C-alpha cells in the first residue's frame, strides 16, 4: 500500500514485534483525527493501513508506543512514544516506509520514498 | 540549569544554528500549555530554558522546528518537526540534555539523564 511501518529493537538486534501504531491526519481546525492503526507484526512490518485513493496530500502523524514495548521487556524507557509528522505530497515518490530504530533512551527515524 | 537542548547538522558536520525550539508541560485537563522556548546559540546548544523549581515532576514535549532549517539551506526535507515526549523528575530531580542528529529525511535524538 502507499504507506508501511517498520520497527527494530537496538538492545536484542530483532524486529519489534506487536508494538502499537497509530496514524492521524491533520484536521482543518488543526487538531489530529484518528486515521488508522494496527501492530507490528513478526518481521516489526505493519502493513495495510490506507489505500492510495485514501492517502490525498496533507500533513500526517505517525506514533509508535515505545513506552509498552519496553515496558513489556522490563526495561526503563526515556520517551513516551516516537512519533513522526511529515507532509505527503502528490509530485515526488508516493510509496513511503517509515522506519524507527529503537533504543530505551534513544530512536532514529528514517523514511524510505519510493517511485 | 535541569534542561538543554542540542541539535546536529549530520550533513555537514555542523552544530545547527538559530534553530527554533519550543517546550510544552501536560497540565492537569490533559492540554499542553506553553512551557519555555528559545533558539540554538552558535554552538548549536540551548542553556537557560528553566530553573530548578520551575522544572517540577510532568510530561514535557520538545518540539524542534527542523523544517526552517532545512527550507533555510534550500531543502525541502521530510519531516515538518523533531518532537520529543517524556516524563521528568519522577523519581527526584535531574538534568536533561536532548540531543538531536538531523538529515533532510531522518533524525535521531537521545537523553542524557544525570544526577546533580
Ligand atoms: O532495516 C530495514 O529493512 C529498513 C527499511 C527501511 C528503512 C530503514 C530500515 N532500517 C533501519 C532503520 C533505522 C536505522 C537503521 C540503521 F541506522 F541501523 F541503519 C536501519
Ligand atoms: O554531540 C554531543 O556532544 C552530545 C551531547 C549530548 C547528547 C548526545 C550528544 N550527542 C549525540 C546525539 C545524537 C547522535 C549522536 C551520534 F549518533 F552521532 F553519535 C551523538
Not at 486515521?35 to 485513493?53: M, Q, W, Y
Not at 496530500?57 to 521487556?73: N, R
Amino acid at each position: 500500500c502507499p504507506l508501511m511501518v517498520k520497527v527494530l529493537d537496538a538492545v536484542r538486534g530483532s524486529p519489534t514485534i506487536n508494538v502499537a501504531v497509530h496514524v492521524f491526519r491533520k484536521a482543518a481546525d488543526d487538531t489530529w483525527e484518528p486515521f488508522a492503526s494496527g501492530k507490528t507484526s513478526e518481521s516489526g512490518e505493519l502493513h495495510g493501513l490506507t489505500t492510495e485513493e485514501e492517502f490525498v496530500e496533507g500533513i500526517y502523524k505517525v506514533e509508535i508506543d515505545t513506552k509498552s514495548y519496553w515496558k513489556a521487556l522490563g526495561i526503563s524507557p526515556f520517551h513516551e512514544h516516537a512519533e513522526v509528522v511529515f507532509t505527503a505530497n502528490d509530485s515526488g515518490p508516493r510509496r513511503y516506509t517509515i522506519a524507527a530504530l529503537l533504543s530505551p533512551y534513544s530512536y532514529s527515524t528514517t523514511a524510505v520514498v519510493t517511485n
